[PDB]
Design a binder for this molecule. Sequence first.
Ligand SMILES: Nc1ncnc2c1ncn2[C@@H]1O[C@H](COP(=O)(O)OP(=O)(O)O)[C@@H](O)[C@H]1O
Ligand SMILES: Nc1ncnc2c1ncn2[C@@H]1O[C@H](COP(=O)(O)OP(=O)(O)O)[C@@H](O)[C@H]1O
Ligand SMILES: Nc1ncnc2c1ncn2[C@@H]1O[C@H](COP(=O)(O)OP(=O)(O)O)[C@@H](O)[C@H]1O
Ligand SMILES: Nc1ncnc2c1ncn2[C@@H]1O[C@H](COP(=O)(O)OP(=O)(O)O)[C@@H](O)[C@H]1O
Lengths: 458, 455, 455, 458
Amino acid sequence: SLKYDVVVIGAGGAGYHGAFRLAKAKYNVLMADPKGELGGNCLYSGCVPSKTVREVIQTAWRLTNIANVKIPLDFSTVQDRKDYVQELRFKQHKRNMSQYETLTFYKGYVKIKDPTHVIVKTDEGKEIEAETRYMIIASGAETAKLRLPGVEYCLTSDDIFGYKTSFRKLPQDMVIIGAGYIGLEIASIFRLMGVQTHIIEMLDRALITLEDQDIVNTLLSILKLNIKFNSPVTEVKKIKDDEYEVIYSTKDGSKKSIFTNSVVLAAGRRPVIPEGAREIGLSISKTGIVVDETMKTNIPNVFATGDANGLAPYYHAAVRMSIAAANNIMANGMPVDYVDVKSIPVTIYTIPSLSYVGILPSKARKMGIEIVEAEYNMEEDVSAQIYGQKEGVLKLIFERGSMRLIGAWMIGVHSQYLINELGLAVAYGLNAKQLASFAEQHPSTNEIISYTARKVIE
Amino acid sequence: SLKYDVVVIGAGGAGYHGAFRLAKAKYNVLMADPKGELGGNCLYSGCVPSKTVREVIQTAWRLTNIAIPLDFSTVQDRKDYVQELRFKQHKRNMSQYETLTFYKGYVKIKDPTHVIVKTDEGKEIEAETRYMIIASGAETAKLRLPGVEYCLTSDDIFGYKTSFRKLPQDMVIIGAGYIGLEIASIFRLMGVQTHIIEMLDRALITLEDQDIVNTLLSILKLNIKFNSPVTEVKKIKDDEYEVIYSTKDGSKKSIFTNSVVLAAGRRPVIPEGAREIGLSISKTGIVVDETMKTNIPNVFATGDANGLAPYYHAAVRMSIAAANNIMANGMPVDYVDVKSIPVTIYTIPSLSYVGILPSKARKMGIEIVEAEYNMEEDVSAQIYGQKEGVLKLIFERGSMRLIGAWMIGVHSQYLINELGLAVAYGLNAKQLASFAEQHPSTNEIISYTARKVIE
Amino acid sequence: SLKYDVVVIGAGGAGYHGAFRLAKAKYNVLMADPKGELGGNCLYSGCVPSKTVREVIQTAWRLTNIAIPLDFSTVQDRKDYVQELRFKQHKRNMSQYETLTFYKGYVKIKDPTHVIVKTDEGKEIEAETRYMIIASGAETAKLRLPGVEYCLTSDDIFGYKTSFRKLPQDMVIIGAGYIGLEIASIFRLMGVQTHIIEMLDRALITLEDQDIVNTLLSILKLNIKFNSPVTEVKKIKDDEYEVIYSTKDGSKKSIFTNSVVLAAGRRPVIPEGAREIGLSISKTGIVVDETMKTNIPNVFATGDANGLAPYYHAAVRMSIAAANNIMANGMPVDYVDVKSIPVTIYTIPSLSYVGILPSKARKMGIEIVEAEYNMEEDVSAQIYGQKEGVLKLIFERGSMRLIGAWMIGVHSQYLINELGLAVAYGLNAKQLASFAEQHPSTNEIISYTARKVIE
Amino acid sequence: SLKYDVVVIGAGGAGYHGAFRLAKAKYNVLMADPKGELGGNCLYSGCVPSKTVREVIQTAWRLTNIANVKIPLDFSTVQDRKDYVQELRFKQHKRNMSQYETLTFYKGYVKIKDPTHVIVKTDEGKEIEAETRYMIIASGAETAKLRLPGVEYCLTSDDIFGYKTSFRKLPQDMVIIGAGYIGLEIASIFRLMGVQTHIIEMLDRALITLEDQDIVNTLLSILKLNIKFNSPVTEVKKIKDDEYEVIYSTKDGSKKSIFTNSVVLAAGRRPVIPEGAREIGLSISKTGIVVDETMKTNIPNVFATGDANGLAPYYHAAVRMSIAAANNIMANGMPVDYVDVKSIPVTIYTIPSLSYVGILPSKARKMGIEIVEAEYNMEEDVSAQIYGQKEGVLKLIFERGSMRLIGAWMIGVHSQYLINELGLAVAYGLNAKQLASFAEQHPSTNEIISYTARKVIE
Ligand SMILES: Nc1ncnc2c1ncn2[C@@H]1O[C@H](COP(=O)(O)OP(=O)(O)O)[C@@H](O)[C@H]1O
Ligand SMILES: Nc1ncnc2c1ncn2[C@@H]1O[C@H](COP(=O)(O)OP(=O)(O)O)[C@@H](O)[C@H]1O
Ligand SMILES: Nc1ncnc2c1ncn2[C@@H]1O[C@H](COP(=O)(O)OP(=O)(O)O)[C@@H](O)[C@H]1O
Ligand SMILES: Nc1ncnc2c1ncn2[C@@H]1O[C@H](COP(=O)(O)OP(=O)(O)O)[C@@H](O)[C@H]1O
């Protein structure tokens, strides 16, 4: 009834970067999100605040290893800094949005009527009915709605890192349900702030999202967390404030119990499908809305970007997917842009962190690619030594013959920065020689990459 | 005589990385350095200790900004522990190579194939060799003025086990070169009141782009005086000095301070006997080509002694190139591309740069487009309250090849390596735009900034 | 710059005795030597350690002759204990002088009034001075032949804390100069079979009198080959070598031995930068006059670096003379008389000599009378069974002034000082005849021999 | 009845050097000595054998300080070497004598009839009656014939050092009667060979022959001998072989006793006056035959040389005196030669030895000569250090004004060699400057002299 070029459902990374590119091309674009803010869940309660918290505490700890006396920091001060940062960024995305005159934004939820028609339902409000030529579904994911008694007594990430959260005081000890990336991250950071942590995992292994058990095992050997495997939780009991009981079965079948001050549910997140999506015939699987590499669904004027598709549930990937949807829409659905998920780096933000990119040795084995590995030991890097954080390794994965760098992984200080240099090499197929001949800035940690590449040849 | 395949004079990065590679291939190599340690001056008094001090005090300051006192002596203890550890590490690595012989001593060159090594004990070992690598580095320039004796140098400040273990309240720094700016920046953050006096008309002459230097100065806001040659330093009491200087016009002025630092540039170090054998040597250093070969065809020269790129990581790369060419018995199988080696000035915030910058592009006749990002918007800048700065990408029109980049801001030292790789192997704006940096690392601003040019 | 009155380069006897005297008068003096000890090469590897070995093994042998086994390692322990003690003694003495600053380092000369001292740490201290004393000594000559690397030098043999701690059974010595003859003599007495090969036609060229050298050789009875340049030293096994040499005629010959010593003379050591400032320098060393003043008028040169009299005690005397002249602000108040400095070649028995000898007297046109004594008749020679030798007094006809003397025999090193004093201050035959030496010291032969000329 | 130019009474140093010089001038000379050998008492039983013994034992001890294990030497082997040396020298003086055809030698004693006539009494023989123009009395001295009960049980120097002596076995301990030079020497050497020594001295002080108590005290502080002063011996008792009792009074008057294996009489020697000497009117005092500096007596054709005159009872002085007598006789009694006793060096052959020459500080004080002393400490000399014999000092005595070296003394290693260099300076009056400017052979001990002279100026 009002008319637009594109509707974007969801205003996280998956949505707004695309929307901004379209708007800049003078496309009329309607974006709607219930939060009424940009950044989605990742800004509201994921990466941004979690890293903020991670940095403040890492800075405290490095200083404690250097001045070798203990440093006094209240968790409420850490949570203030997390909020100050979230607040700057909400304002900044609004101020950047306000520059695009042909972009209209609504605080509300989009329901789909048919491939060219939607209805935006606002908070205390009416139906806005809209017509459109293309649609970008960028509705993200949510915390997995588990059916287990006591679920209501568990904290989630939203509670721990949410903007203006009231979780502002540390417990003496905490049980984390789940050994995936969110759980391990939470276990790492809270342990560093003085909390006793226990992880209980249903399955036999941590980090299912990473297919390579040898890499997972190396990280666990460095982390030395208290992890119980093969231990489904069957109930959470609340005794009183700050007193819970988590009940669980074991690999034998015998029930067992652990008492704690605080229970955190770190299950996987699940894709969020907008109302009406099934009804217009959109192919949807377990992992999410099915898309090809151009982000196009089985309905040809409908794209799906970010966690809604499940292809690579990390914020930087969602942004990349968003821009590719925008490009393809501008080219009127001709496939002019594509996303290469292999070459997207991933970081698990434990302390130390694990980063990786490309093809790792186990997938290489299954594809029949013959490889050669090069190895560096992080005890020998300058910054590691300064800060007293000497654990970890870098591993470069080269294909035999071409010696193309086809993959890389790294546990240690600054892996999040190094992984990008290496991801670039991987994405455009540089070889050991090119890596050896490059001369990274001394004394930065990136200097271990050309160094490690010089090794393989020698 | 004792016969060797290669003799490496100097055991800094310009020396030992190549020695190691030649030894790994079982060449018989002889290396000497008077310190009797690996790492050169860079380790003893340059990059490792200065960046260690820099990282420690910036960590103190970051935490200060987000929520504690550290004495300077503790910082300097940390600097010393790291130096010590790395000396031990290079010796451990050296012990792996059976065919590498190391002496504590100076090398004199006798002819293109003969050297003698002089030890302290006064022993002199004669040796014959097929190739030499001159990796003998550089040394502090020695200005002659009354009162120079009262000046501290960066060697006094960062030297291993230095006695400089207490902070003056006010400090005057002679030189606006990169060592001057770095010292001023770090010490200002530890609470020292700093002042720079520079005889020439500008800062950072090693950087041809004045627009970039002006941007850095405007963000750093240092008290600097230009066209002000010092004529005398007078001592009045302990921890009390008068720096006397001349204005542009010719009139005398003076400043009173607690401490004076000389930072006047470095000069290439030429081994005894190098001149006598006819090595072609300019002002800037031993003349070499890109293969690191000198006018004498079995003699190579690497690192600060050649003056092409006086940074440790450039030095390591040249050492490796010398070793590859020697192994190919002189054939030029390896070459160093200087413009694609990143440089970082370690002020706070730092300046990093690589490749071809606008001043140079203009002189070459290359037409360019610049894409830019303001560091106020970076997540890590926000977390730390370090919001000053800017990233600029330099693209070649037509190809949109990335030919240069410069950045002032936090983590410029990490970002510049990603960018340096793109410059080195010729990636274009589309390629950088299509790559997805790890969120929320500061690296995300690169592809973010490449996406904006395309818009 | 730091301002000094004098800079002394080298801390051997040629350096420190003068430094000490200048410091005693409160001059500000700066001294440097890379060993970071006083005593020079003489202490580290020359006279003190060699004479210590000589005295120990001659004491063993005397007792053997009058009535027990000593391992060579014990001798070398004794040599090391004495060296150690004297290093400590010179440091104790140096600590008495508040105005003397000592560095472990090399001095480079920049101009007649400026030096820089380079330390191992790599620190370089610039310094300005009114006077210099170049006291930088001498070094082993470096013959270039295949297998030189297998040769021991007297440095290896007598050096402080040397690893040479076990005696070979047979030894070949290259050089019939005084170090060659001394080494051969001592080691023969420890049971080593010695052989000398000398390229030139005679021994001890530093001594112009062939009659004297022939007398010494005829008493020493060493196996020596003349006109026999070595062309190669080959190693066959541990403790097994082939010395290959050419005859006068041109034909090749070889000798098989367990050990080879090179003793090829010493060469003067010239500080870096001395040439560059225009110091007049010959083959034999830095040219000086008798005041020790060089062609640069505020620069003096003492000891083996000048080459006039390359013996420690001559060096000490020149150091003192430099210091007196400096104190007189350059006026020539003190002079060294070389011919009146005694010399002793420390073979067993030794040869000592002083003043003008017959070869020289003949060339000058001085007519002489020689008085002589046979050492068979000396009491101490008889007690020890060391009866080989002769004392000769050289008298000037008319005056009967004692102008020279030479002696082979026991205690020649003590007797020569009495005689040197008579030569130096011009005593005549009557005066020596009238003096009554302590009986039964070996000195009684002097006045005994002066009484016979008068008869 | 036979006719000669000169008669020489005694064939020691005082006699034969003069005799040889005369004979060489073709003077007919008759020399007679009861020993029938040349060298006198000094060769028979003084310096030559005592130094021989001293050297062998010093060589043993130096080697013991260097190899730092003990060295085995029987005293009989030391006595063999003493005899071998004495034997060479008896033969050598005879072989040198045989070269002078106008010198006639007799084994016998000379009696003087009048200034021009003597009688030689041979061993199993007649009177040879002789006429002569000059006479040289060179009859030396003997061991002082003391009146004390038990004197016959004491050894003397003649017994200890005599040629072919039967004293060839060391006692465990020995009492030495006398703290003069012979006694201290004997105490030094025997102590070094393992013997326990005690010296008992009549007088209040050691070394009366040296007027300077400060010098004597320094030597005693280094020697650390067992000396009893003010203790005249009153009797020597023999219990059995190797068992004696020496009885003595003390400074109070109370008798006391010491038991020993061996008693040595080290009294002063006394001049020996030939028969007839008094009767012709020769002036004779306590110290000996009175002579002027030309060795001439009150009877003008009679000279007296060596210990017979008592002016300087050391062998090298006696030789010097002999030659001066020979010269003056040749010049027919005109005083053409003179002896300067001040400038004759003296050594006391303890271990370490003391040597001295010239004017010492106490005589200087009495003459009113103002002096300055220079001092060197023997711990710092090379040879001292090699041999481990580091005790002692060198002292140079300069007159103020001229800075003439007027005296010197030295306790330590090689003082006997150094004293000659210094005696030469003293005899011809060199000054500090001349000593400083001279450069003694390095590394000999004489190098401490120019060194010490350089000090005084500084
Ligand atoms: N029907 C809908 N209409 C509008 N917004 C939606 C709808 N369903 C979910 N969203 C929003 O989409 C956003 C997705 O953000 P996020 O979970 O960070 O995913 P991504 O990383 O894929 O952007 C959330 O802010 C959520 O409120
Ligand atoms: N003649 C010489 N012989 C041996 N080493 C030398 C000589 N001259 C200088 N050097 C050494 O060479 C090293 C140079 O290293 P450095 O100054 O760090 O430069 P680079 O980074 O180019 O290696 C120093 O450690 C210095 O001591
Ligand atoms: N450039 C220099 N700077 C300082 N000392 C030096 C230099 N060259 C040589 N030397 C030192 O000078 C000393 C010379 O002493 P030595 O060889 O014993 O001769 P001399 O007997 O003449 O003193 C040696 O210890 C040597 O290390
Ligand atoms: N009347 C005499 N006739 C000949 N010889 C004598 C007479 N009296 C003593 N003698 C001898 O004179 C010698 C003196 O020797 P010595 O005591 O060494 O004194 P000096 O050192 O004075 O020569 C002795 O050998 C002794 O036998």
